[PDB]
Short mmCIF file of all heavy atoms in Angstrom, two decimals:
data_model
loop_
_atom_site.label_atom_id
_atom_site.label_comp_id
_atom_site.label_asym_id
_atom_site.label_seq_id
_atom_site.Cartn_x
_atom_site.Cartn_y
_atom_site.Cartn_z
N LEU A 1 106.28 87.93 94.66
CA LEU A 1 107.61 88.29 95.14
C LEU A 1 108.67 88.05 94.08
O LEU A 1 109.59 88.86 93.90
CB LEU A 1 107.94 87.51 96.41
CG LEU A 1 107.24 87.96 97.69
CD1 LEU A 1 107.34 86.89 98.75
CD2 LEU A 1 107.83 89.26 98.19
N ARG A 2 108.57 86.93 93.36
CA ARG A 2 109.59 86.60 92.36
C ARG A 2 109.46 87.47 91.12
O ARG A 2 110.46 87.96 90.58
CB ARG A 2 109.52 85.13 91.99
CG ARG A 2 110.03 84.18 93.06
CD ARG A 2 110.22 82.78 92.51
NE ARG A 2 108.96 82.15 92.13
CZ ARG A 2 108.59 81.92 90.88
NH1 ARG A 2 109.35 82.27 89.86
NH2 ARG A 2 107.42 81.33 90.65
N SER A 3 108.23 87.68 90.64
CA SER A 3 108.01 88.41 89.40
C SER A 3 107.17 89.65 89.68
O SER A 3 106.09 89.54 90.27
CB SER A 3 107.30 87.52 88.37
OG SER A 3 105.99 87.19 88.80
N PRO A 4 107.63 90.84 89.27
CA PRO A 4 106.82 92.04 89.49
C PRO A 4 105.60 92.11 88.58
O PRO A 4 104.69 92.90 88.86
CB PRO A 4 107.80 93.18 89.21
CG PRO A 4 108.79 92.59 88.26
CD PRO A 4 108.93 91.15 88.65
N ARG A 5 105.56 91.32 87.51
CA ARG A 5 104.41 91.34 86.60
C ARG A 5 103.17 90.76 87.27
O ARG A 5 102.06 91.27 87.08
CB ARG A 5 104.74 90.58 85.32
CG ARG A 5 105.86 91.19 84.51
CD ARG A 5 105.43 92.53 83.93
NE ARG A 5 104.28 92.40 83.04
CZ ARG A 5 104.36 92.10 81.75
NH1 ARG A 5 105.53 91.90 81.16
NH2 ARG A 5 103.24 92.00 81.04
N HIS A 6 103.34 89.68 88.04
CA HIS A 6 102.22 89.06 88.73
C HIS A 6 101.60 90.02 89.75
O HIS A 6 100.38 90.18 89.81
CB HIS A 6 102.69 87.78 89.42
CG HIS A 6 101.63 86.74 89.59
ND1 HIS A 6 100.70 86.78 90.60
CD2 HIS A 6 101.37 85.62 88.87
CE1 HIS A 6 99.90 85.73 90.50
NE2 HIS A 6 100.28 85.01 89.46
N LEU A 7 102.46 90.68 90.53
CA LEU A 7 102.00 91.70 91.47
C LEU A 7 101.35 92.86 90.74
O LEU A 7 100.34 93.41 91.21
CB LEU A 7 103.17 92.19 92.31
CG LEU A 7 102.82 93.24 93.36
CD1 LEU A 7 101.83 92.65 94.34
CD2 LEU A 7 104.06 93.73 94.06
N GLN A 8 101.89 93.23 89.58
CA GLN A 8 101.31 94.31 88.79
C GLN A 8 99.88 93.97 88.38
O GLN A 8 98.96 94.74 88.68
CB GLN A 8 102.16 94.59 87.55
CG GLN A 8 101.65 95.75 86.72
CD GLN A 8 101.75 97.08 87.45
OE1 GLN A 8 102.74 97.36 88.13
NE2 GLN A 8 100.71 97.90 87.32
N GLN A 9 99.67 92.80 87.77
CA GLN A 9 98.32 92.39 87.36
C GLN A 9 97.37 92.30 88.54
O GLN A 9 96.20 92.70 88.43
CB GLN A 9 98.35 91.06 86.61
CG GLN A 9 99.36 90.96 85.48
CD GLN A 9 99.40 89.58 84.86
OE1 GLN A 9 99.27 88.57 85.55
NE2 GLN A 9 99.57 89.53 83.54
N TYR A 10 97.85 91.81 89.69
CA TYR A 10 97.01 91.82 90.88
C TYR A 10 96.65 93.24 91.30
O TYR A 10 95.59 93.48 91.88
CB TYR A 10 97.70 91.08 92.03
CG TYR A 10 96.91 91.09 93.32
CD1 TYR A 10 95.61 90.59 93.36
CD2 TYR A 10 97.45 91.61 94.49
CE1 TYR A 10 94.88 90.60 94.53
CE2 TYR A 10 96.73 91.62 95.66
CZ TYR A 10 95.44 91.11 95.68
OH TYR A 10 94.71 91.11 96.84
N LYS A 11 97.52 94.21 90.99
CA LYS A 11 97.19 95.59 91.30
C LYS A 11 96.27 96.26 90.28
O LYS A 11 95.51 97.15 90.66
CB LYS A 11 98.48 96.41 91.49
CG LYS A 11 99.21 96.05 92.78
CD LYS A 11 100.36 96.99 93.07
CE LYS A 11 100.93 96.72 94.45
NZ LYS A 11 102.08 97.60 94.77
N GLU A 12 96.30 95.87 88.99
CA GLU A 12 95.22 96.38 88.14
C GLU A 12 93.91 95.64 88.36
O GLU A 12 92.87 96.11 87.88
CB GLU A 12 95.45 96.39 86.60
CG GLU A 12 96.51 97.33 85.98
CD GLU A 12 97.91 96.81 85.98
OE1 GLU A 12 98.09 95.66 86.38
OE2 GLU A 12 98.83 97.55 85.57
N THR A 13 93.91 94.51 89.06
CA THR A 13 92.63 93.94 89.48
C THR A 13 91.98 94.69 90.65
O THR A 13 90.91 94.27 91.11
CB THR A 13 92.77 92.46 89.86
OG1 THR A 13 93.68 92.32 90.96
CG2 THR A 13 93.21 91.63 88.67
N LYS A 14 92.57 95.79 91.12
CA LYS A 14 92.02 96.59 92.20
C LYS A 14 91.97 98.05 91.77
O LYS A 14 92.77 98.50 90.94
CB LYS A 14 92.86 96.46 93.47
CG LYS A 14 92.92 95.05 94.03
CD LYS A 14 91.57 94.61 94.58
CE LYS A 14 91.64 93.20 95.13
NZ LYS A 14 92.48 93.12 96.35
N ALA A 15 91.02 98.80 92.34
CA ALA A 15 90.90 100.23 92.07
C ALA A 15 91.77 100.99 93.05
O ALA A 15 91.64 100.81 94.27
CB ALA A 15 89.44 100.67 92.16
N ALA A 16 92.66 101.84 92.53
CA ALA A 16 93.66 102.49 93.37
C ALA A 16 93.05 103.51 94.31
O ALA A 16 93.54 103.71 95.43
CB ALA A 16 94.73 103.14 92.50
N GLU A 17 91.98 104.18 93.88
CA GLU A 17 91.36 105.21 94.71
C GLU A 17 90.59 104.62 95.88
O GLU A 17 90.31 105.34 96.85
CB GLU A 17 90.42 106.11 93.89
CG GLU A 17 90.99 106.83 92.65
CD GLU A 17 91.38 105.94 91.47
OE1 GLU A 17 91.14 104.71 91.53
OE2 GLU A 17 91.94 106.47 90.49
N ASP A 18 90.24 103.33 95.82
CA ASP A 18 89.46 102.68 96.87
C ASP A 18 90.33 101.94 97.88
O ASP A 18 89.78 101.24 98.74
CB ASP A 18 88.45 101.72 96.24
CG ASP A 18 87.36 102.44 95.48
OD1 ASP A 18 87.03 103.58 95.86
OD2 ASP A 18 86.83 101.85 94.51
N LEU A 19 91.64 102.07 97.79
CA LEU A 19 92.62 101.42 98.66
C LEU A 19 93.07 102.37 99.76
O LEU A 19 93.05 103.59 99.57
CB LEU A 19 93.83 100.96 97.85
CG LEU A 19 93.53 99.89 96.80
CD1 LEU A 19 94.76 99.61 95.96
CD2 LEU A 19 93.04 98.62 97.47
N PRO A 20 93.45 101.85 100.93
CA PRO A 20 93.97 102.73 101.99
C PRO A 20 95.30 103.36 101.57
O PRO A 20 96.17 102.70 101.02
CB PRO A 20 94.15 101.79 103.18
CG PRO A 20 93.32 100.60 102.88
CD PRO A 20 93.29 100.47 101.40
N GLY A 21 95.43 104.66 101.85
CA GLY A 21 96.64 105.38 101.48
C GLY A 21 96.83 105.52 99.99
O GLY A 21 97.97 105.67 99.53
N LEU A 22 95.74 105.47 99.21
CA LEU A 22 95.75 105.56 97.75
C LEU A 22 96.60 104.46 97.11
O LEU A 22 97.15 104.61 96.03
CB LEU A 22 96.22 106.94 97.27
CG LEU A 22 95.23 108.12 97.20
CD1 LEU A 22 94.13 107.83 96.18
CD2 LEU A 22 94.64 108.50 98.55
N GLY A 23 96.68 103.32 97.80
CA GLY A 23 97.45 102.19 97.30
C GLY A 23 98.95 102.41 97.29
O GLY A 23 99.66 101.69 96.58
N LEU A 24 99.44 103.38 98.05
CA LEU A 24 100.86 103.69 98.07
C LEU A 24 101.63 102.90 99.11
O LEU A 24 102.87 102.88 99.07
CB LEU A 24 101.07 105.19 98.31
CG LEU A 24 100.60 106.13 97.21
CD1 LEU A 24 100.72 107.58 97.66
CD2 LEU A 24 101.39 105.90 95.94
N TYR A 25 100.94 102.26 100.05
CA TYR A 25 101.57 101.51 101.13
C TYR A 25 101.01 100.10 101.11
O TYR A 25 99.84 99.88 101.43
CB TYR A 25 101.32 102.20 102.47
CG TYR A 25 101.62 103.68 102.44
CD1 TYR A 25 100.61 104.61 102.29
CD2 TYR A 25 102.92 104.14 102.56
CE1 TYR A 25 100.88 105.96 102.25
CE2 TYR A 25 103.21 105.49 102.52
CZ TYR A 25 102.18 106.40 102.37
OH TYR A 25 102.46 107.74 102.34
N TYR A 26 101.85 99.14 100.73
CA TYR A 26 101.39 97.78 100.48
C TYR A 26 102.45 96.79 100.91
O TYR A 26 103.63 96.92 100.58
CB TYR A 26 101.06 97.60 99.00
CG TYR A 26 100.63 96.20 98.61
CD1 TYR A 26 99.39 95.71 98.97
CD2 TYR A 26 101.47 95.39 97.86
CE1 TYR A 26 98.99 94.44 98.60
CE2 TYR A 26 101.08 94.12 97.49
CZ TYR A 26 99.85 93.65 97.86
OH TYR A 26 99.46 92.38 97.50
N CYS A 27 102.02 95.78 101.67
CA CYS A 27 102.85 94.64 102.03
C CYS A 27 102.55 93.52 101.05
O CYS A 27 101.43 93.00 101.02
CB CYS A 27 102.59 94.19 103.46
SG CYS A 27 103.85 93.09 104.13
N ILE A 28 103.56 93.17 100.24
CA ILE A 28 103.42 92.09 99.27
C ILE A 28 103.31 90.76 100.00
O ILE A 28 102.56 89.86 99.58
CB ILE A 28 104.63 92.09 98.31
CG1 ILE A 28 104.93 93.52 97.86
CG2 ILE A 28 104.36 91.18 97.13
CD1 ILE A 28 106.21 93.64 97.05
N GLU A 29 104.05 90.62 101.09
CA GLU A 29 104.17 89.34 101.78
C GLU A 29 102.90 88.99 102.54
O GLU A 29 102.53 87.81 102.60
CB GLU A 29 105.39 89.42 102.69
CG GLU A 29 106.68 89.53 101.87
CD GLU A 29 107.91 89.64 102.73
OE1 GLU A 29 107.75 89.78 103.95
OE2 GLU A 29 109.03 89.61 102.18
N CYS A 30 102.23 89.98 103.11
CA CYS A 30 100.92 89.79 103.70
C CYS A 30 99.78 90.10 102.74
O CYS A 30 98.62 89.88 103.10
CB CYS A 30 100.77 90.65 104.96
SG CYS A 30 102.03 90.35 106.22
N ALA A 31 100.09 90.59 101.53
CA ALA A 31 99.12 90.94 100.49
C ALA A 31 98.07 91.93 101.00
O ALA A 31 96.87 91.76 100.78
CB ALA A 31 98.44 89.69 99.91
N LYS A 32 98.53 92.96 101.70
CA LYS A 32 97.62 93.87 102.38
C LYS A 32 98.02 95.33 102.16
O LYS A 32 99.20 95.67 102.17
CB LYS A 32 97.55 93.57 103.88
CG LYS A 32 96.36 94.20 104.59
CD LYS A 32 96.48 94.10 106.10
CE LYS A 32 96.55 92.66 106.56
NZ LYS A 32 96.54 92.55 108.04
N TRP A 33 97.02 96.18 101.99
CA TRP A 33 97.22 97.62 101.86
C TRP A 33 97.04 98.30 103.20
O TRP A 33 96.24 97.88 104.04
CB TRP A 33 96.26 98.22 100.83
CG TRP A 33 96.67 97.99 99.41
CD1 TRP A 33 97.54 98.73 98.69
CD2 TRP A 33 96.21 96.95 98.55
NE1 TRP A 33 97.66 98.22 97.42
CE2 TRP A 33 96.85 97.13 97.31
CE3 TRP A 33 95.31 95.89 98.70
CZ2 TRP A 33 96.63 96.28 96.22
CZ3 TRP A 33 95.09 95.05 97.62
CH2 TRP A 33 95.75 95.25 96.40
N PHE A 34 97.79 99.38 103.41
CA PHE A 34 97.81 100.09 104.68
C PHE A 34 97.62 101.59 104.45
O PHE A 34 97.88 102.10 103.36
CB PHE A 34 99.11 99.84 105.44
CG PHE A 34 99.32 98.40 105.79
CD1 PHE A 34 99.94 97.54 104.90
CD2 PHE A 34 98.88 97.89 107.00
CE1 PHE A 34 100.13 96.21 105.22
CE2 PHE A 34 99.06 96.57 107.32
CZ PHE A 34 99.69 95.73 106.42
N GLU A 35 97.18 102.28 105.50
CA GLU A 35 96.83 103.69 105.36
C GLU A 35 98.07 104.58 105.32
O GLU A 35 98.03 105.66 104.73
CB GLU A 35 95.90 104.11 106.49
CG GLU A 35 96.45 103.88 107.89
CD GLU A 35 95.58 104.49 108.96
OE1 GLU A 35 94.35 104.57 108.76
OE2 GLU A 35 96.13 104.89 110.01
N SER A 36 99.17 104.15 105.94
CA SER A 36 100.32 105.03 106.08
C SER A 36 101.60 104.20 106.14
O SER A 36 101.58 102.99 106.39
CB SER A 36 100.19 105.91 107.33
OG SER A 36 99.09 106.80 107.22
N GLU A 37 102.73 104.88 105.91
CA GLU A 37 104.04 104.26 106.06
C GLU A 37 104.30 103.84 107.50
O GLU A 37 104.89 102.78 107.74
CB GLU A 37 105.13 105.21 105.58
CG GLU A 37 106.51 104.58 105.49
CD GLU A 37 106.65 103.61 104.33
OE1 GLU A 37 105.99 103.81 103.30
OE2 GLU A 37 107.43 102.64 104.46
N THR A 38 103.88 104.66 108.47
CA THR A 38 104.04 104.27 109.86
C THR A 38 103.16 103.08 110.21
O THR A 38 103.56 102.23 111.02
CB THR A 38 103.77 105.47 110.78
OG1 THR A 38 104.07 105.11 112.14
CG2 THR A 38 102.34 105.99 110.67
N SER A 39 101.99 102.97 109.58
CA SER A 39 101.16 101.78 109.76
C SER A 39 101.83 100.55 109.17
O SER A 39 101.78 99.47 109.77
CB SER A 39 99.79 102.00 109.12
OG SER A 39 99.09 103.06 109.76
N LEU A 40 102.46 100.69 108.01
CA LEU A 40 103.18 99.57 107.40
C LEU A 40 104.37 99.14 108.26
O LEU A 40 104.63 97.94 108.43
CB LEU A 40 103.63 99.94 105.99
CG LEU A 40 104.34 98.89 105.15
CD1 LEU A 40 103.56 97.59 105.14
CD2 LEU A 40 104.53 99.40 103.73
N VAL A 41 105.11 100.11 108.81
CA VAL A 41 106.25 99.80 109.66
C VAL A 41 105.79 99.12 110.95
O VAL A 41 106.42 98.16 111.42
CB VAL A 41 107.07 101.07 109.93
CG1 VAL A 41 108.15 100.82 110.98
CG2 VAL A 41 107.73 101.55 108.65
N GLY A 42 104.68 99.59 111.54
CA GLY A 42 104.13 98.92 112.70
C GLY A 42 103.63 97.52 112.39
O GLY A 42 103.70 96.62 113.23
N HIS A 43 103.10 97.32 111.18
CA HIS A 43 102.71 95.99 110.74
C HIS A 43 103.91 95.05 110.64
O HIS A 43 103.82 93.88 111.01
CB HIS A 43 102.01 96.07 109.38
CG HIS A 43 101.89 94.75 108.69
ND1 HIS A 43 100.99 93.79 109.06
CD2 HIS A 43 102.58 94.24 107.64
CE1 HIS A 43 101.11 92.74 108.27
NE2 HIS A 43 102.07 92.98 107.40
N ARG A 44 105.04 95.56 110.14
CA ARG A 44 106.23 94.73 109.97
C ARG A 44 106.82 94.25 111.29
O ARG A 44 107.67 93.35 111.28
CB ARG A 44 107.30 95.49 109.19
CG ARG A 44 106.96 95.75 107.74
CD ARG A 44 108.22 95.96 106.92
NE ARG A 44 107.94 96.53 105.61
CZ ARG A 44 108.04 97.82 105.32
NH1 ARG A 44 108.43 98.71 106.22
NH2 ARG A 44 107.76 98.23 104.08
N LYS A 45 106.41 94.82 112.42
CA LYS A 45 106.91 94.44 113.74
C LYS A 45 106.11 93.30 114.36
O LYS A 45 106.62 92.59 115.23
CB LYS A 45 106.91 95.68 114.64
CG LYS A 45 107.44 95.51 116.05
CD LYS A 45 107.51 96.84 116.78
CE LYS A 45 106.12 97.35 117.12
NZ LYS A 45 105.47 96.51 118.16
N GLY A 46 104.89 93.07 113.88
CA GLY A 46 103.98 92.13 114.53
C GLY A 46 104.16 90.68 114.16
O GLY A 46 104.99 90.32 113.32
N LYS A 47 103.36 89.82 114.80
CA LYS A 47 103.46 88.38 114.56
C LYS A 47 102.85 87.88 113.25
O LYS A 47 103.42 86.92 112.70
CB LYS A 47 102.86 87.63 115.76
CG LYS A 47 102.95 86.11 115.69
CD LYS A 47 104.38 85.63 115.81
CE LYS A 47 104.46 84.36 116.63
NZ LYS A 47 103.61 83.28 116.06
N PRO A 48 101.71 88.38 112.73
CA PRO A 48 101.25 87.88 111.42
C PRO A 48 102.25 88.07 110.29
O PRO A 48 102.41 87.19 109.44
CB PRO A 48 99.96 88.68 111.18
CG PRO A 48 99.44 88.94 112.52
CD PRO A 48 100.64 89.16 113.39
#
């Protein structure tokens, strides 16, 4: 969250084609990839 470089390196430690939504939808705070923007918005409403 503080430094985008740390998140960047964590993202080259993963293959982008093997991620849900081609790695375009990602919650940094839960460290989780999602299939869609509506899935990410629904995730942001929940308790975890």
Side-chain angles (χ1 to χ4, degrees):
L1 285 164
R2 287 193 293 109
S3 66
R5 296 292 299 274
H6 208 280
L7 181 61
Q8 183 66 41
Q9 310 176 323
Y10 178 57
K11 288 188 172 179
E12 292 85 4
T13 61
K14 299 291 180 68
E17 304 68 5
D18 291 331
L19 295 174
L22 277 296
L24 293 173
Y25 311 99
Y26 177 73
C27 195
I28 316 173
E29 293 179 353
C30 303
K32 196 191 299 185
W33 281 276
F34 299 87
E35 57 172 31
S36 296
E37 189 72 31
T38 186
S39 296
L40 183 50
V41 172
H43 165 75
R44 292 203 194 98
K45 182 174 72 68
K47 182 69 142 57

